[PDB]
Design a protein around this ligand. Structure first.
Ligand SMILES: O=C(NCCCNc1nc(Nc2cccc(CN3CCOCC3)c2)ncc1C1CC1)C1CCC1
Ligand SMILES: O=C(NCCCNc1nc(Nc2cccc(CN3CCOCC3)c2)ncc1C1CC1)C1CCC1
Ligand SMILES: [Cl-]
Ligand SMILES: [Cl-]
Lengths: 276, 276
C-alpha cells in the first residue's frame, strides 16, 4: 500500500521523523523510483492551534535554495493535510552519526562546520534564523553510497518550522510608511535572537568534540531555570582541544547574546579558514 | 460598476486607504446594503517579494476577535489577489479626527486610551505585537451617526500586516522537543520588541495632547539616525500636563526598551483607572 503525493509516493510504514505538527516519510518519484524524497505531512487543524503559519516553511525553503539546505520539490494541499516533498538525506541525522562514531576529529568537525557555515551565510543574507538547530535536523547526504567516508558527506539543514524572518532597516520604512510612531528598536532592527543559531551550532560542535552537550538537564524545566539563574556560564573544554577551536567554542557558547560572537566573526573565525 | 466579493460588493472608486501591498475600499453587503464593510485587496505577487506571509493577518484577526479590534467577516481568494472583508469604521482614522479637533482634552485622551489599552490586553494575552501602530490605523467607529460626541466613539485597531507572534516558555519546549541545543534567549522568550506598541501609543497620546508627534523628522533616514545617535531622549511635556499623564508619557516614551514601562504597569497606570 503506497500513498500517492503528486508524482511521488510513500509508505506510511517508512516514518523517518516527526514532531508536534508533522510526520516525515521516506518516499520516491513514482516513475524515477531511485529518486528518493522526504515527504512531510502537516495536519492543518493541529497547526492552527499553534502560532505557526502554514506557508512559512514553504516560502523559506524556496528562498533558501542552496546545497546545504534541503530542497523543496512540490507542495500538495488536501482538505486535512499539506504535503511538502523535499530532498531526502540518505545518511540520516547527525545524532545517529555521532552515536555510531562517538566523537569526531577536529578535521572532521572543520569539514562539517564549513558546510554549516555556508548554510548559515544564506540564512544570514535573507535575514532568517532557524531557532531550533540540533543534531536531529542537521542531516547527512551521500551522493554515492560507495563514497561513504567523511569527504562523501554533504550536510543539509532541515525543519524550518520554528524559523523567523528579521526585517532590515528600510524593510520597516519601505512597507510601513512614515516611521514617526514606530518604536526605536523596530526602526533600528534590534533583535534579541539574531544570534540564536550561533549558540546552537556551539552546542553541536561541542557535542561532536566531547561526546555530550555542554549543558545537560533532565528536562526542559531544569534547563530553562539553570539558564535563568546562571547569567554567566563557562563550558568545560578539554585541555587537548586546539586553542582556536576552544576560542570558537567559548565565543559561540556565551550565555548572554550581547557577549556572543556575531555571524561575520563566526564565518571568518580562523578555525574555519583552512586547506585540508 | 460594482466589484463582487462573495456576498459583498465595492466600487474601485471608494478607496479608503492603501500601503505597499494592499488597498482598502469602503463596500457593503450586497443585500443588507446598510451593512458597510472595509474590503482589503492584497496582490499576491507583490507580497511574495516581501518577508510578509499571506495568512498572518487572517489568523491574527480571527484570534484577536474583540470590540476594539476590527473584525474579519470573510476571505475570498482569487488567482492574483486575496480579499479580506472586515469591519468598516465609519469615523475614519485618528489622524483626521486630530486634524479636525487640533488637540484633545485629558478626559478625551483617557477615554480613547482605555479602549486602546483593552485592545492591547487582548494582543498581550495572545503574545501578539502590532509594531506599526499610528493614527492612520487607530480607527473611529460611530454606532449611531446621531451620537457623534466622544462618548459615541468606539476605537478599533487595524492593519496587522506588520505584526508578529512572541512565543511563551513551553511554546518553545511543547513543539520543538528537547531544548538542549536551543539558545538561552529562545528558551527564555527574551524579545527586544515586546514593548514596541507601548512606545507607539506614547507617541500617539503625546500627539493628541500636544498637537504634534514628540520626535519629528523630515524622513525615515533622519529619524533612524536621530534614534541611533541619541541613546537617551526626553520628550517635551507642557507644564500644564497633569502630573500622572506626564508620568505615563515619560514611561512610554523611553528610547531604551529596558527602561520603558511594561504592559502590566501601562494597563494599571493610575491615569487610566478613573470614573467619569
Ligand atoms: O524534518 C524534520 N526532522 C528532520 C529529520 C526528518 N526529515 C528528514 N529526514 C531525512 N532523512 C532521514 C532522517 C532520519 C533518519 C533516516 C533513516 N536512515 C537513513 C540512513 O540510515 C538508515 C535509516 C533518514 N531526510 C530529509 C528530511 C527533511 C524533510 C527534509 C522534522 C520532523 C517533523 C519535521
Ligand atoms: O487598513 C489599513 N489602514 C487603515 C485604514 C484603512 N482601513 C480601514 N479604514 C476604515 N475606514 C476608513 C478609513 C479612512 C477613511 C475613511 C473615510 N472617511 C469615513 C468617515 O468620514 C468620511 C470619509 C474610512 N475602516 C476599516 C479599515 C480596516 C480594514 C479594516 C491599511 C491600508 C492597507 C491596509
Ligand atoms: Cl516571520
Ligand atoms: Cl510571526
Amino acid at each position: 500500500s503506497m500513498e500517492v503525493v503528486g508524482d511521488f509516493e510513500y509508505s506510511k510504514r517508512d516514518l523517518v521523523g516527526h514532531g508536534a505538527f508533522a510526520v516525515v516519510f521516506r518516499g520516491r518519484h513514482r516513475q524515477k523510483t531511485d529518486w528518493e524524497v522526504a515527504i512531510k505531512s502537516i495536519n492543518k487543524k493541529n497547526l492552527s492551534k499553534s502560532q505557526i503559519l502554514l506557508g512559512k516553511e514553504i516560502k523559506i525553503l524556496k528562498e533558501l535554495q542552496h546545497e546545504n539546505i534541503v530542497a523543496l520539490y512540490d507542495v500538495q494541499e488536501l482538505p486535512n493535510s499539506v504535503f511538502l516533498v523535499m530532498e531526502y538525506c540518505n545518511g540520516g541525522d547527525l545524532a545517529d552519526y555521532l552515536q555510531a562514531k562517538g566523537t569526531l576529529s577536529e578535521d572532521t568537525i572543520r569539514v562539517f562546520l564549513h558546510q554549516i557555515a555556508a548554510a548559515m551565510r544564506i540564512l544570514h543574507s535573507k535575514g532568517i534564523i532557524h531557532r531550533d538547530l540540533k543534531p536531529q535536523n542537521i542531516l547527512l547526504s551521500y551522493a554515492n553510497r560507495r563514497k561513504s567516508s567523511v569527504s562523501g558527506i554533504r550536510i543539509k539543514i532541515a525543519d524550518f518550522g520554528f524559523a523567523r524572518y528579521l526585517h532590515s532597516n528600510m524593510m520597516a520604512a519601505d512597507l510601513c510608511g512614515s516611521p514617526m510612531y514606530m518604536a526605536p528598536e523596530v526602526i533600528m532592527s534590534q533583535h534579541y535572537d539574531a544570534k540564536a543559531d550561533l549558540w546552537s551550532i556551539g552546542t553541536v560542535i561541542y557535542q561532536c568534540l566531547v561526546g555530550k552537550p555542554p549543558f545537560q538537564a533532565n528536562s526542559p524545566q531544569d534547563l530553562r531555570m539553570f539558564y535563568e539563574k546562571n547569567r554567566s556560564l563557562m563550558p568545560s573544554i578539554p585541555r587537548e582541544t586546539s586553542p582556536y577551536l576552544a576560542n570558537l567554542l567559548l565565543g559561540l557558547l556565551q550565555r548572554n547574546q550581547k557577549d556572543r560572537m556575531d555571524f561575520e566573526a563566526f564565518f571568518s573565525h580562523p578555525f574555519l579558514e583552512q586547506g585540508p
